[model samples]
Target: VDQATLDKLEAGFKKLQEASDCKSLLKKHLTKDVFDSIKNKKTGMGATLLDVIQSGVENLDSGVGIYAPDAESYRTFGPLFDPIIDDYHGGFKLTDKHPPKQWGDINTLVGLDPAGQFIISTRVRCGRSLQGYPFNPCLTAEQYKEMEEKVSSTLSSMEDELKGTYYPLTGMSKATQQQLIDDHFLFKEGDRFLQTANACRYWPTGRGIFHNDAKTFLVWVNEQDHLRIISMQKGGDLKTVYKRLVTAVDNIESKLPFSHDDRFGFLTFCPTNLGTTMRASVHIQLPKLAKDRKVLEDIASKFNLQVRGTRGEHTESEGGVYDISNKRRLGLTEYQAVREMQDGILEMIKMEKAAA
Candidate 1:
């Protein structure tokens, strides 16, 4: 989504708009050969800025999307662990919302410095069940399975609204290239990499945090082949959120720029998205997971998904507050070594469910 490429996309779309019977022309142009080239893992054309912008615009036209929502309701008393990851949970909560509790101070524990990366933290709530208590310890395993279908479907359909995007995730730098084997920090064990603060949207850097309380969904630009473009939403820790984010992107034929949905602000309580937090985020590759498409269907049957907002309680609660985080890739953007560590988290959760 760089400037030069963005210009090309804007012009391309304007051309398509001018041409007669443009819809037919577009369908004909969307060939498998062109698409396959973009999907090439190593050397593919990346999505352009126009692609992502189109995705947003198209989704909006279809009555299934929006760029920015009013934060009046969301920021009223947003919970933010301030003092730079301060231990107290309630300390992050805003008492008044008339003036909107200032802007940057809402979610940041220690007021984030502008120039450098700041360390920040918060207790993000995930998943829930009607049968469970306190919304913590909510949703049973069976419920998660059923909910997975709904959530996954809800996620997948967004692709149609996404008109187009960059592909192949090119510019194969250290992060996206095969060099990821050893140079990648996630490969190392027990490294914090960027502090949990960067894991959230733009609270510290003053970049992505939109909305009144920095409540806007964070989007990091991505492009491949200098053609397509799309942005990833910043939420959750990188480990917990990425695989599924990749899966969502793959299904949508879009490239996700570096974003950690698993970091923070993923599934917290709000009047809008309450209950049905049966969020199941797993990074599964169709090729690696199966030799054929049919096999993929069977693997899905094994794990049911529960759908609800809000997680069940932590073994220990912070007064009425509760937050849980999985592992983190220390010393690097994402350590490949931590993939197993990430999987281990889901495995551990499965075991806990088995015991329950």
Candidate 2:
């Protein structure tokens, strides 16, 4: 290795040894192995060890704190990540996981808030990878175009409320892009965590946002995954939101082939999102409970919920608004995952009202 790179490796190793929260997290398991496996590795995008460890290193609680540039990288770095995966996923393998169970009729999903006064919005989204293509960093320009073209055709052919135009990010104006993100209608860009993971290689090419005329049902193409089907809307009509998401996933799966493993249900770049890969969330006002962040966090934890600021993770809350979502994705069925959020939020609302 070059002197400069070697210096960096030395520094990284030292930092891993000194940080209180991080020092021994992953390094405790593999000191030299992590160093050797990543010491000379490079991807087409010139990915480095720093990129892989950026998020993991900073967030030491992450048992294995890195993202693989490709499936091969995951295999190569198994010594560092496999243990963390086993610990977090409770030893479940993606290869051993079965396909998702029936989600039942969308009409049957129960709403989280019957009064609808406490909730601001509800959203349910899931990621899908194509069966044949490698992850984002490995995808070529042509593959992106091909994947987009295929998905767009299927989306355009929709006959009812789900029909919408695909807005390619290729030439999207800065103002428009920001507006979409601000409105929570689209995924955020230039994510430092993803950059460190070697996931954002192509910039805007082959990237696009699709939303039905109502904008409630949307799809993000080539974001962190090949397809991110989303269902969301104002207020807490979670049943409808989940119904939209369930129907959309079914329709897309029928038309497109997705990468899935017997044990994991659906394959994703991030091990945490291996199965179901669904994140169901809502924005709510929990004024009294939110006054003490720890109290709210503790209560949410009791119900297996993750609470974030109104804007999203790491952002501060505005007024009394907070974003609450389910925490488990890999081990649960899609229906079960959504149910966890729905039931938990209803409990949260009740606690908020009682606390107030």
Candidate 3:
């Protein structure tokens, strides 16, 4: 390793050691011995150990506190990543293997909130990376542009309901971007975690958003991953929402090759998204359950779900609305991931009704 990289790693280690309140997994597992073992290693793309831990070091409040700079970093730095992965993915150890892609049966799902009582909206999203390209931290400006071009062209050729226009972040106005954010249709930039990870080097150059005219299906290009395929709609018609997402993902996958590994299932920039790479969630108002936050969380945990703020991670809940979704992504199939969330929500709704 270069002196500069070593210096950064040492300084970061010092900060992590001194921060008494930082409870990230990175701080928990990155002991002196572990750090010494991986500090000198680099990925094929030349990403150093610093690249993998920079986000967690910079954001002391981070939950997991680490990101894979590239796919290979998962293996090259397995000593550091394995524990974090196992911890976050619910005991998915290094020896455990993630299952292959399985859609299961979408037809088995029914609308969770057909009456639209407690549910406001439902969404299902998954991340994908194009084959042969390194993760965001190692992507070149030229590669970003090239991938954007390929993705935009492929999306434009869609003649079905997935057809939509690509809005390149390069020329998007602040007002337009803010509008999309308010509508929950766009991702905000300058995320402290991503910024510190060196994932935002090219800014908006190769970044963009594509959404159907109805705004139910969308894709985020060059964000945390090469693509974030999403399907969403108002109320809790998860059947339609998930089906749309499956269709869109199938169509896109046919045109562009996505990186996948036998053990990891789908390769992503972050190990947390390794297996299914799917997050199926709903913005719900559980006023009765919300009265006791601890109780709500306890119940959610029992169902293998995570409760986040309405605005997403690290944000606070608004008007008693919470974003609840599946917590386990790796070591499971895509269908199972969504089913976990669906079953959990159904149980939560039943509790809400009883409380009412």
Candidate 4:
């Protein structure tokens, strides 16, 4: 490593060691032994250990401080990644294997609020990385533009409901982008965690959003991952939303190659999203159960679900509306991931009714 980068790493290590109160998994697991073992290693893409740990080091309060600068970093830095992965994924051991893709009967999923009381909308999204490219931190401006071209072309070729318009972030106005963010249809930029990871290098270069005319199905190109395929709609029709996501994923997989590993199921920039990489969630009001936030969270943990604010992570609940979804992504099938959210929401609704 160069003297400049080495100095930064040494400074970061000192800060992390001194920040005894920090709760990030990275701080907890990155012992001196681990650092010595990985400090000298570099990925094939020339990503150093510092590139993988900088995000966590910069964000002292982060839940998981580490990110894979590229897919190969997962293998290159397993000594540091394995324990954190196991902890975050709830005991997905180094030897355990991720199950194959499965989208079990969508019809079996029942709406959480058929009477239309508390549910606002349902969304299911999964991150995918193109087979040939490295993750965001290592991608070049040219690579980003090339991937966007391929993505837009493939998405544009879709017939039927999946056919949609692609809006490049390059030409979009600030107002239009804000409107999309406020409407929960587009991803917001300037996330500190991602910024520290060096994932936002090209900015709007290869970044864009593609959505169907109805805006129910959308794909985020070159955000946190190469593609974030999403399906959503108003109310609690999770089965429909999930089915749409499955169809879109299948259609896209038929054309563009996605990075995958037999053991990891689906490879991603974050180890937390390695397996299924699917997050099936709903925005619902649970005023009664949420009266005591700790109680709501405690019960959510029982069902293996995470409760987030309406806008998602690093946000807070508003008007008693929460975004709850499956927490474990690795070591599970796609169907099982959605099912965990489904069953948890069902139980949560029952608790809400009892609270009434």
TM-score of 2: 0.85
State each model's C-alpha RMSD to the native: 23.4, 3.5, 1.2, 1.2
Better of 2 and 3 by TM-score: 3
Which ten-residue region of model 4 has the weakest summed lDDT?
A: 1-10
Model 4, position 347, has a per-residue lDDT of 86
Report the C-alpha lDDT of model 1 over 1-356, residue by residue, as the tens digit.
35565455455445544544433313233234432332222111232223222332332221111110111212211221111111111112233111111112112222111222211121121221111211111223443333333333333334333322211212335353333223211112111211110111221111111011121111121100101111222332433233333333344333222111222222222121211111222222222333433443343323322111112211222222222222221111222212322343344334433442
What digit string (tens of lDDT, one per residue) describes model 2 on residues 1-356? 36676676667767777776654345665477667766676555565555556566555545456665555555455555566555555554525444565575566567777787778899998988887787776778888888888888888876587889999999999999999989988888886666656577778788899989899999999888889999999988888888888878888888888887655568777766668888899998877888888999899878778888777775778888888998777777788788888889888888888884
How many steric clashes does model 4 contain?
A: 1
- The Cα error of candidate 4 at residue 244, in Å, is 0.8
Flag regions of model 2 displaced more than 4 Å: 1-11, 23-51, 58-64, 87-101, 104-108
lDDT of 3 by residue, 81-187 (tens): 99888888888876788887888898999899767889999999999999989999988999999999999999998777888899999999999998998888998
Give me the runs in candidate 3 sitting further than 4 Å from their true place. Answer: none
lDDT-better candidate, 1 vs 4: 4
Every candidate's lDDT: 0.24, 0.76, 0.90, 0.90
Model 1 clash tally? 63
User: Per-residue lDDT of 24-139 in model 4, one digit per residue for the tens?
Assistant: 99999998898888878887778988998999998998999999988779878889998999988888887898888888888888887888888899999999999999999888
Model 2 CA lDDT for position 82: 62
